[PDB]
Structure 1
Amino acid sequence: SATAASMNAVKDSLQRGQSTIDVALAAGDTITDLLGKMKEKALAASDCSLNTASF
């Protein structure tokens, strides 16, 4: 029964790990969206027929 109590202690560490990885995943989704937008902006800025004001 001592071992079963120890497993009761293990579950808390696993739950904390779950929470940490969830936060990381949310931030990562936001970052991927921003990276797509940045790629579009960089593609638009590479046009050679633009004014000095659009660049």
Structure 2
Amino acid sequence: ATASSLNSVKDSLQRGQSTIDVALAAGDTITDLLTKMKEKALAASDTSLNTASFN
């Protein structure tokens, strides 16, 4: 009964790994977007741009 009981534990573990995989797949996009936002704020910090490039 214990040996047959372990299959649900294995299923829950694979389900948790799949959920973490989806989380990392979203985190890749979130990280590249944060990097592009840092690049935009860094370029915008400069005072040599005119108003149009700032907007």
Q: TM-score, normalised by structure 1?
A: 0.90
- Structure 1 unaligned runs (5+)? none
Structure with greater helix percent: 2
Q: Within 1, Cα distance between the matches of 2:47 and 2:21?
A: 43
Q: Within 1, Cα distance between the matches of 2:42 and 2:33?
A: 14
Tell me the alpha carbon deviations over residues 2-46 of structure 1, each in whole angstroms, 9 at most, x when there is no partner. Answer: 000110121111111011000001101111111111101000011
Aligned to 1:27: 26
- Structure 2 unaligned runs (5+)? none
Aligned to 1:49: 48
Identity %: 91
Aligned Cα RMSD in Å?
0.7
- Kindly report structure 1 stretches of 4+ aligned residues shifted beyond 3 Å: none
Residue 49 (structure 1) shift:
1.4
Q: How many residues were matched structurally?
A: 54
